[PDB]
DNA sequence: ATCAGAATCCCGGTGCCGAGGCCGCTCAATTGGTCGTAGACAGCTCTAGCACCGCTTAAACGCACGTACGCGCTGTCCCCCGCGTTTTAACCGCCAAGGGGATTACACCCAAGACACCAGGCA
DNA sequence: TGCCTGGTGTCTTGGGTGTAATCCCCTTGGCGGTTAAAACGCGGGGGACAGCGCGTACGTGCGTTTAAGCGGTGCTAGAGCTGTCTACGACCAATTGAGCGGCCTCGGCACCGGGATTCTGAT
């Protein structure tokens, strides 16, 4: 199903998943396509993002710093991940001007 | 039809207030009430019974639901409450 | 291709617990990779932290012709090896016929239109003669006993074992060099088997688990894998390359149409179904 | 401390409308029985958590000292509060109408099948 | 006594999803008043805010000491897996009584008004 939906993401196992995790009694059969490709997309946008920071920092692996980096630098990753924490992330560099010298 | 918990409100009230009513708003405030606790207990049952591969919800997963959920002595006393009521209900 | 798994001891796993990787039967970088940790931890005497050694550093390396010349000319001479051609037609058109033409072509030499290759013949409906394949070596020249020693023949009852007979396949192809895989009547088994209407996405999902298999052994093999449809599913035009339509002229010559190829004109050639052969029309 | 005035609290009367109770009904919980399966328990394995010893060295700690910053004080001025006056639109009540929420009535596809029926005269 | 040659006809559901016709009452829309709240002006006072002085607590550095860390080794508790079986919960049919919708009424509360008390600010 993974294939016929054009996807890298494991359909066949979400569905799986979906029906053992008592969710609901019935599951159409579009639904784990749909959240495959969802979950899919998502660790794309913060796969791309994070293989930046990498680069940036002339890495070629991502390690967990690069997705707090990531994650952090951009706003509507930062707002779904709100209540997260990345182990081994760190912080954004940032001092606040106030205390920096005169 | 439409389902409350209102004429169960009344009855605890009346057991506790023989005398004191109780307002529509006020009763709407208390159908939230349990609806609310009902969907916060319940779930954290379910997610227990996952967690440990189980696929029965029982007064056990109930229990820990209500340790986990409930502040000290509202915990304390809700367990025991419990407890005696399906104590009572066995027999 | 594969990985194999030597590959991952330079990785600085250590040889026992590659040892033991291919005990459990992974043999390649890209086997252990794309499988999680805990395959590789069953194995006797593997840690979790030698597996994960394992998946961390594992993830760093990872024309045959048909016979009718006419018919060679339409598929300007004759079908691509390593790709599946699909010929749908009606009963009686010769499908079971080319098939045993085809499966002695394929043994000619690539000069004389063959793959020298060793040919499949994947049955679904009983029709497998080797007397018939003994006349079209005669035909073409070829021993009959060697094309039926470059046949290797199994009857697939269900659409389980029809895909299990392509495990087979994929073993065996390994070990001798093929040019042909043929399988007759292949949908027949996923109107029996599957012939209800909530199960049209049952059937349509086993053909396209079978498909991509199919598709994993051409580019494997580089081999011509020819299948049978009768049209009395919409998932094979994805995948046939090449769709032709057989219809009957009456006695033996068959009239064949081209009813898809992205590239080959849509087209029609006159052929025949002679003793020997499937062979062009001579009136 | 005093006192006047403005605001709030309290006390009583009247009304009104929503809470409490009763009754019909209906459908959802109960009871009784059956059956599959899941989880409770026993038992075995073998992983990893805990305990320990020793060495090293980097971090913690104690202290000295200087100084930057927290904090208190003072002055200024500006801008928010509080109150009086004007305006305006929120709110109450009443009516119209229509639109959408809830209920009942209506195609497209693949499927192949199935044989019958005798009549008309001349040279 | 012994002779051939003539075409042309029909008519047939089933399964499982999407659509409009139906319909009714509340959501939307407007009119009219009336009154309380919003808007606006203005005076002033007190609070925000800037400047200044000081003193003390915190940052920095250095010598000492302390223990965290790392590496090896040991063992045993307990996590985790498997097998078996029995208790227990899903399921299903019949029953019925608890619970809900509707109707009615009366008493708690709200609105009004007027005196008492509190509290604030100027003296």
Same mark, same amino acid.
């Given at each position: ?102 | 039809? *439409?389902? @409350?918990? @209102? ?5 605890? %009230? ?13 009763? =709407? ?13 319940? =779930? ?8 440990? *591969?189980? @696929? ?11 340790? %986990?959920?409930?502040? =000290? ?10 407890? *005696?009521?399906?104590? *009572?209900?066995? @027999? | ?6 590959? /991952?001891?330079?990785? &600085? ?7 033991? /990787? +291919? ?16 395959? /590789? ?35 300007? &001479?004759?079908?691509?090896? &390593?790709?599946?051609? +699909?010929?749908? &037609? ?36 009983? !029709? ?26 199994? $009857?697939?009852? #269900? ?27 292949? !949908?027949?088994?996923? $109107? ?35 299948? !049978?449809?009768?049209?009395?599913? #919409? ?6 390359? !090449?769709? /032709? ?6 006695? +033996? ?20 179904? #002679? ?9």
């Amino acid at each position: 199903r993974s294939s016929r939906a054009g996807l890298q993401f494991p359909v066949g196992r979400v569905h799986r998943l979906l029906r053992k995790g008592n969710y609901s009694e019935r599951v159409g059969a579009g639904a784990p396509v749909y959240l495959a490709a969802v979950l899919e997309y998502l660790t794309a946008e913060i796969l791309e993002l994070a293989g930046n920071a990498a680069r940036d920092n002339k890495k070629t692996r991502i390690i967990p710093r690069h997705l707090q980096l990531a994650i952090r630098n951009d706003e509507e990753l930062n707002k779904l991940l709100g209540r997260v924490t990345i182990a081994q992330g760190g912080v954004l560099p940032n001092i606040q001007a106030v205390l920096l010298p005169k | 039809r *439409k389902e @409350s918990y @209102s004429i169960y409100v009344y009855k605890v %009230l009346k057991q506790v207030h023989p005398d004191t009513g109780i307002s529509s708003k006020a009763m =709407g405030i208390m159908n939230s009430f349990v609806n609310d606790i009902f969907e916060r207990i319940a =779930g954290e049952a379910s997610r227990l019974a996952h967690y440990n *591969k189980r @696929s029965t919800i029982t007064s056990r997963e109930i229990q820990t639901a209500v340790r %986990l959920l409930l502040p =000290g002595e509202l915990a304390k006393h809700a367990v025991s409450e419990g407890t *005696k009521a399906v104590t *009572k209900y066995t @027999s | 291709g594969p990985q194999p798994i030597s590959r /991952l001891e330079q990785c &600085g796993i250590n040889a026992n617990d590659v040892k033991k /990787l +291919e005990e459990a039967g992974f043999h390649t970088v890209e086997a252990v990779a794309y499988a999680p940790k805990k395959e /590789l931890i069953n194995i006797k005497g593997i840690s979790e932290a030698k597996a994960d050694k394992i998946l961390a550093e594992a993830a760093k390396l990872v024309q045959i012709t048909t016979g009718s010349k006419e018919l060679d000319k339409l598929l300007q &001479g004759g079908i691509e090896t &390593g790709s599946i051609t +699909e010929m749908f &037609g009606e009963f009686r058109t010769g499908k079971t016929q080319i098939c045993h033409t085809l499966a002695v072509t394929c043994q000619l030499p690539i000069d004389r239109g063959g793959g020298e290759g060793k040919a499949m013949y994947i049955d679904t409906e009983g !029709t497998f003669r080797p007397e018939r394949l003994l006349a079209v070596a005669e035909r073409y020249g070829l021993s009959g006993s060697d094309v039926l020693d470059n046949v290797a023949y199994a $009857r697939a009852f #269900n659409t389980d074992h029809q895909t299990q007979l392509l495990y087979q396949a994929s073993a065996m192809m390994v070990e001798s060099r093929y040019a042909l895989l043929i399988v007759d009547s292949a !949908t027949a088994l996923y $109107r029996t088997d599957y012939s209800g209407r909530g199960e049209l996405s049952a059937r349509q999902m086993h053909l396209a688990r079978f498909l991509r298999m199919l598709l994993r052994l051409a580019d494997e093999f580089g081999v011509a894998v020819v299948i !049978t449809n009768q049209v009395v599913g #919409n998932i094979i035009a994805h995948a046939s390359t !090449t769709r /032709l339509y057989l219809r009957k002229g009456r006695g +033996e010559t068959r009239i064949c149409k081209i009813y898809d190829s992205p590239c080959l004109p849509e087209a029609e050639a006159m052929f025949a179904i #002679n003793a020997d052969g499937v062979g062009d029309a001579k009136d």
